[PDB]
Amino acid sequence: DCPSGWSSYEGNCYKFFQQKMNWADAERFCSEQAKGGHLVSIKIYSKEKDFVGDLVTKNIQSSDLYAWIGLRVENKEKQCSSEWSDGSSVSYENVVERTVKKCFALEKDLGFVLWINLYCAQKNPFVCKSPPP
Amino acid sequence: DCPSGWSSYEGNCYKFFQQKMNWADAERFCSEQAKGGHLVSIKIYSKEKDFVGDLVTKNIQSSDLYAWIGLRVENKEKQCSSEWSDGSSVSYENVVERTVKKCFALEKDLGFVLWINLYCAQKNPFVCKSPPP
Amino acid sequence: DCPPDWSSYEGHCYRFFKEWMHWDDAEEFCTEQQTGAHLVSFQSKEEADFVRSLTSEMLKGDVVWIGLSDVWNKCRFEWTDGMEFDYLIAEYECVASKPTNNKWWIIPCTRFKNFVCEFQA
Amino acid sequence: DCPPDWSSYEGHCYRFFKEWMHWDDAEEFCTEQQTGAHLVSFQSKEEADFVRSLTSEMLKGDVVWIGLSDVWNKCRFEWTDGMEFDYLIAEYECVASKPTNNKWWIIPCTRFKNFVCEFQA
Ligand SMILES: [Mg+2]
Ligand SMILES: [Mg+2]
C-alpha cells in the first residue's frame, strides 16, 4: 500500500511534487519523504516512461517546462570531452559554471517522456520514487 | 529626468517589472504606464543593451531566466521556412502551437544582453521604455 | 523498384534510418545515400500516413527529423515601438514529426534523432 | 615554419579568423587551411592568454570557437538510486571562449562564431 498521494507502478511508489527545488535539494527532499526515497529513476524502454510522464502531465502547472529526475552526469570535470579536436588530451579547463548542465529532467515538449540536461542550480518541480512501505 | 522607479538613459526612461505577463499583455501594460511607452527596444550597437542588461540584473528578483523585450516575429505563418530541404514549397503543415516561438526576451545567461525567442504565451517579467516625462 | 530496403509510395522512395543524428547531419546523410535524396517532405496527410508505417523501430513517443530547418532565422522581425529591425538573431530550430499522431514539433536542430529520407530522383 | 598571417607561440602557430561558422564548419575549415590544423586547443592559462591577444578583429561580448564538441553526450551518467545506467540523450553542444577573461561557455554547436585555428611547426 503506497502512502496516500503516491501512485504505484511495478512494485514502487511515485509522486510528483509541484514545489520547485534545485536538483540536489530535490533529491534530499525525496529521501526525506519516504525511506528509500530518491528522485525518480526511469527505464526508458518500459512502460515506466509513460507512467511517470503521465504523473507529471496530469499534475504539473501549465507554465513549468521541466521536472527533475534522478539522473546526473557522473564526471567530476565540468565538460566531458577528454580530448581536443586536434587529439591532444584535455587537462586545463576554464568553464563558466552557469553553462554547465549536469542534471537531467523530463521536458514538457512531447509529454515529459524525454530527457534533457540542465544547470543543476535551476529550481524545478520533480518526481520522487520509493519502495512500498 | 524620469519618474520615480524609472531609470534614465540617453534621455529616455526604463523600468524592469517583476509581474509575470505574456508578451502581448506586457506590451499593452508598458503602453499604459506612460505615453509612448513600449516593451524596450534595443539598439544592440550602442551602450543601451549594456544599460538594459545591468538594469535587469540589478533589479530582477527570482531565478527567472527571461525578461520580455519588444521584438517579435512579424510573419503570420507558424514558422518561416517556405521550402522543404528538397526545394518543395510548404503548404501542408501540422505544427504544434506551443513550439512556435515568435516573442523575444533577454536571457539571464551572459547578463541579459543576449536575446532568445520564446512561445509568446509564456509569462515572464519585462522591461518597459518610455519617453521622458 | 527502390534501392535495397527502401519503400515505394506514389513514385517516390522512402527509408527510415534508426541512426541518431542532428538535423544537418541527417539531411547530409540522406543526400549521400542516393542521388537527389533529402530528408522527407510531406505534401499531404496521406504521405505522412505512409511514412508512419516505416517508423515502428523508433523509441515510442519520440520524433523523427523531417525536411524543415532554421525555421526562425528566415523570419522578418519588428519592434513594437516602430523602430526598424537592424538585420544570428534567433534559435536554430528544425522540424521533427511524431509518427503516431502526425504532429510536428519545432525543436533545437542540435537534438539527435532518427529520421526518414526520400527521393524521386 | 608557419606561413604569414598565422602568429606563433611556444612552438605552435595560431590564427584568428573573421568568418562566421557553425562549430563543425569551423573545425573542418581549420583542417583545410594547413595540414594537421584544427580549432585551437588550450593546454594552459598562458596559452589562452596569448590567443586572447589575437582576437583583435572581433566584436565583443561574443565568443570564439575552441576545439571541444559534443561535451555532454561524451559523459558518463548514473541514477541516485540503485538503478544502473544502460549505455545520445543530450544536445550537440560545443565550447567557445570569451576573449575578455578567457572563460569558456558551452553553447549549441550550431551557433555561428568566429574562431581560432592552430597547428604544430
Ligand atoms: Mg515528399
Ligand atoms: Mg594547443
Side-chain angles (χ1 to χ4, degrees), chain A residues 1-44 46-133, chain B residues 1-34 36-44 46-133, chain C, chain D residues 1-34 36-121:
Chain A
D1 194 290
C2 288
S4 301
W6 293 63
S7 303
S8 71
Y9 173 76
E10 282 197 298
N12 291 297
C13 304
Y14 304 68
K15 185 178 174 186
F16 169 77
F17 288 84
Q18 184 63 64
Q19 317 171 59
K20 287 183 169 184
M21 295 176 92
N22 61 48
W23 190 88
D25 290 342
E27 162 67 22
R28 182 168 65 267
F29 178 98
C30 290
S31 72
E32 291 173 356
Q33 288 297 303
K35 217 182 277 66
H38 290 285
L39 272 170
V40 71
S41 59
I42 301 167
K43 303 184 200 62
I44 197 69
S46 70
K47 285 191 180 176
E48 183 169 46
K49 163 174 123 297
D50 281 357
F51 172 74
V52 180
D54 175 88
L55 265 189
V56 178
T57 295
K58 297 277 296 185
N59 297 295
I60 191 165
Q61 293 176 184
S62 61
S63 56
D64 305 322
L65 296 74
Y66 312 111
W68 296 127
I69 61 175
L71 190 74
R72 187 176 192 282
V73 166
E74 194 183 81
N75 307 55
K76 303 301 176 58
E77 293 71 19
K78 295 182 180 301
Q79 63 76 42
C80 305
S81 181
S82 59
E83 57 180 271
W84 298 83
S85 55
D86 65 9
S88 71
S89 299
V90 169
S91 61
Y92 169 65
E93 187 172 283
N94 193 200
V95 178
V96 178
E97 241 281 347
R98 231 192 182 300
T99 60
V100 175
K101 305 188 259 292
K102 290 187 182 177
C103 291
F104 285 78
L106 299 172
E107 242 194 308
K108 181 184 180 76
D109 287 350
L110 290 172
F112 295 107
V113 295
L114 304 175
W115 317 331
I116 192 175
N117 53 313
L118 304 175
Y119 175 45
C120 293
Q122 230 184 65
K123 293 194 182 190
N124 290 302
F126 52 97
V127 180
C128 296
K129 177 181 183 180
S130 71
Chain B
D1 189 23
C2 287
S4 175
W6 297 65
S7 301
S8 180
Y9 177 82
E10 287 301 74
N12 290 297
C13 306
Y14 304 78
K15 187 187 177 186
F16 169 74
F17 286 87
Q18 265 289 170
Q19 210 184 317
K20 290 186 173 184
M21 304 179 81
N22 54 55
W23 191 84
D25 293 343
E27 167 62 30
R28 183 173 192 176
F29 180 92
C30 290
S31 74
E32 299 169 357
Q33 290 305 84
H38 293 287
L39 273 170
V40 69
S41 65
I42 301 168
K43 296 176 277 59
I44 200 168
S46 66
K47 303 187 72 175
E48 176 170 43
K49 71 172 188 170
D50 304 293
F51 175 75
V52 176
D54 282 357
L55 183 69
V56 182
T57 312
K58 301 178 184 178
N59 295 66
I60 191 166
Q61 41 181 53
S62 47
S63 64
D64 292 358
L65 304 167
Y66 317 115
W68 293 129
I69 62 178
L71 184 68
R72 180 183 203 288
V73 171
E74 188 247 16
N75 302 253
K76 290 65 177 180
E77 316 81 70
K78 286 184 183 172
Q79 51 80 41
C80 312
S81 182
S82 64
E83 297 190 7
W84 290 88
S85 66
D86 74 352
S88 299
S89 293
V90 171
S91 184
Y92 172 66
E93 70 81 11
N94 200 195
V95 179
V96 168
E97 299 178 5
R98 65 167 292 83
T99 66
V100 176
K101 306 170 191 69
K102 294 177 175 184
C103 293
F104 290 76
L106 290 173
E107 191 180 356
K108 192 175 186 175
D109 290 43
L110 227 295
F112 288 112
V113 41
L114 283 295
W115 321 329
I116 181 179
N117 54 304
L118 307 159
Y119 174 48
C120 298
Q122 264 190 49
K123 294 185 178 178
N124 296 302
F126 50 100
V127 177
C128 295
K129 180 183 180 177
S130 77
Chain C
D1 248 295
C2 300
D5 288 310
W6 287 66
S7 296
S8 311
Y9 183 68
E10 302 204 22
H12 300 46
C13 292
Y14 304 71
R15 188 179 185 185
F16 169 77
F17 287 92
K18 196 183 181 183
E19 294 180 56
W20 281 265
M21 293 179 200
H22 53 67
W23 198 93
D24 292 309
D25 270 1
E27 165 64 13
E28 198 192 26
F29 182 89
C30 288
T31 74
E32 303 182 315
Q33 307 310 299
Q34 282 294 308
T35 293
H38 297 278
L39 278 167
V40 69
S41 61
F42 295 146
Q43 318 295 167
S44 64
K45 187 203 66 177
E46 293 76 10
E47 187 173 16
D49 283 354
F50 176 73
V51 176
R52 179 209 309 168
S53 71
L54 313 171
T55 64
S56 60
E57 303 306 303
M58 79 176 303
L59 175 71
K60 214 69 184 182
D62 204 351
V63 293
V64 302
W65 284 135
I66 61 178
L68 291 171
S69 66
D70 201 5
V71 309
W72 304 128
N73 291 310
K74 297 179 181 183
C75 305
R76 311 186 220 70
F77 309 90
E78 67 190 6
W79 294 96
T80 59
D81 61 20
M83 170 182 98
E84 195 172 72
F85 176 69
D86 186 57
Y87 290 79
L88 186 168
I89 164 179
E91 295 269 294
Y92 184 76
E93 302 199 317
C94 293
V95 186
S97 178
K98 183 166 172 47
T100 68
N101 57 22
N102 194 195
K103 288 193 189 189
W104 300 1
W105 293 73
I106 297 178
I107 62 175
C109 302
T110 41
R111 287 285 175 66
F112 289 88
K113 301 290 181 181
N114 285 160
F115 52 96
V116 178
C117 299
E118 160 181 21
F119 81 82
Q120 57 175 297
Chain D
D1 213 306
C2 306
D5 307 8
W6 292 73
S7 183
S8 305
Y9 165 86
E10 296 218 59
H12 287 62
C13 291
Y14 317 71
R15 184 184 178 191
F16 178 80
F17 283 78
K18 228 299 178 179
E19 279 68 58
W20 295 83
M21 314 182 123
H22 282 188
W23 193 92
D24 286 336
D25 291 331
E27 167 63 17
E28 185 183 65
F29 175 92
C30 284
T31 71
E32 276 168 34
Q33 299 309 93
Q34 301 224 69
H38 290 272
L39 272 170
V40 65
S41 60
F42 297 153
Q43 295 179 57
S44 56
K45 153 169 58 66
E46 289 63 47
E47 180 179 11
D49 291 331
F50 174 70
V51 175
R52 171 171 56 186
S53 80
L54 311 175
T55 65
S56 63
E57 195 83 306
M58 187 185 109
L59 7 73
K60 225 197 71 172
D62 198 19
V63 294
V64 63
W65 287 132
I66 61 182
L68 293 176
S69 66
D70 209 15
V71 305
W72 299 133
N73 284 310
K74 288 174 175 175
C75 302
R76 286 188 302 285
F77 312 97
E78 63 168 38
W79 296 97
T80 56
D81 68 0
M83 190 175 283
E84 80 168 305
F85 188 79
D86 198 306
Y87 298 87
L88 309 183
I89 58 176
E91 270 156 44
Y92 189 41
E93 303 218 312
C94 290
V95 189
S97 182
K98 189 176 184 181
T100 56
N101 61 328
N102 284 170
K103 287 293 183 174
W104 307 352
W105 294 75
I106 299 174
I107 59 175
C109 302
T110 49
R111 289 289 170 66
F112 290 81
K113 299 292 181 189
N114 289 328
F115 50 96
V116 179
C117 296
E118 178 195 331
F119 75 89
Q120 266 175 289

